[PDB]
Predict the structure.
Amino acid sequence: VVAAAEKTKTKEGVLYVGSKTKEGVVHGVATVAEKTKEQVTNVGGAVVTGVTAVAQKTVEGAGSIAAATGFVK
Amino acid sequence: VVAAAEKTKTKEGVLYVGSKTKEGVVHGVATVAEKTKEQVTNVGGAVVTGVTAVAQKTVEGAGSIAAATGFVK
Amino acid sequence: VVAAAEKTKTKEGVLYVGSKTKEGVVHGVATVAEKTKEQVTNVGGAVVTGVTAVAQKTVEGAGSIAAATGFVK
Amino acid sequence: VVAAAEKTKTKEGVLYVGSKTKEGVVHGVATVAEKTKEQVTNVGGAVVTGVTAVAQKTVEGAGSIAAATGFVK
Amino acid sequence: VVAAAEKTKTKEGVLYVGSKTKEGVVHGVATVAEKTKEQVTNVGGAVVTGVTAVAQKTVEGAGSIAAATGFVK
C-alpha cells in the first residue's frame, strides 16, 4: 500500500459563509457495531460534515490516497 | 495498491454561501453493523455532507485514490 | 490496483449559494448491515450530499480513482 | 485495475443557486444489507445528491475511474 | 505501508464565516462498538465536522495518505 505525492513549483480562493441553525446534530465519520464479529473501516481523504459544509480547493497539488482494507482468513 | 500523484508547475474560486435551517441532523460517513459477521468499508476521496453542502474546485492538480477493499478466505 | 495522476503546467469558478430549510436530515455515505455475513463497500471520489448540494469544478487537473472491491474464496 | 490521468497545460464557471425546502431527507450513497451473504459495492466518481443538486464542470482535465468489483469463488 | 510527500518550491485564501446555532451536538470521528468481537478503524486525512464546517485549501502541496487496515487470521 504505497501512496506517493510529489509537487514541484484579484481574488483567489476567497470564501464567504453565513449559517444560522436553530438546532444541529452532526455525526461526522462514525462506525457503529452492535453484536458484529468483524468490522473493518477505512476512511481516507477529506470529509467535511456540517449542517452547512463547504469545501473549497480541497486538493491543490498532489493528493494520493492509497487504501487496502481487507481481512484474510 | 499504489497511488501516485505528481504536480509540476479578477475573481477566481470565490464562494458565497448562506444557510438557514431550523433543524439539522447530518450523518456524514457512517458504517453501521448489527449482528453481521463481516463488514469491510473503504471511503476514499472527499465527502462533503451537509444540510447545505458545497464543494468547489475539489481537486485541482493531481488526485489519485487507489483502493483495494477485499477479504480473502 | 494502481492510480496515477500527473498534472504539468473576469470571473472564474465563482459560486453563489443560498439555502433555507426548516428541517434537514442528510445521511451522506452510509453502509448499513443487519444480519449479513459479508458486506464489502468502496466509495471513491467525491460525494457531496446536501439538502442543497453543489459541486463545481470537482476535478480540474488529473483525477484517477482505481478500485478493486472483491472477496476471493 | 489501473487508472492513469494526465493533464498538460467575462464570466466562466459561475454558479448561482437558491434553494428553499420546508423539509429534507437525503440519503447520498447508501449500501444496505439485511440477511445477505455477500454484497460487493463500488461507487466511483462524483455523486452529488441533494434536494437541489448542481454539478458544474465536474471533470475538466483528465478523469479516469477504473473499477473491478468482483468475487471469485 | 509507505506514504511519501515531497514539495519543492490581492486576496488569496481569505475566509469569512458567521454561524449562529441555538443548539449543537457534533460527534466528529466516532467508533462505537457494543458486543463486537473485532472492530478495526482507520481514519486518515482531514475531517472537519461542524454544525458549520468549512475546509479551504485543505491540501496545497503534497498530501499522501497510505492506509492498510486489515486483520489476518
Observations:
- The first strand of chain D starts at residue 2 and ends at 8.
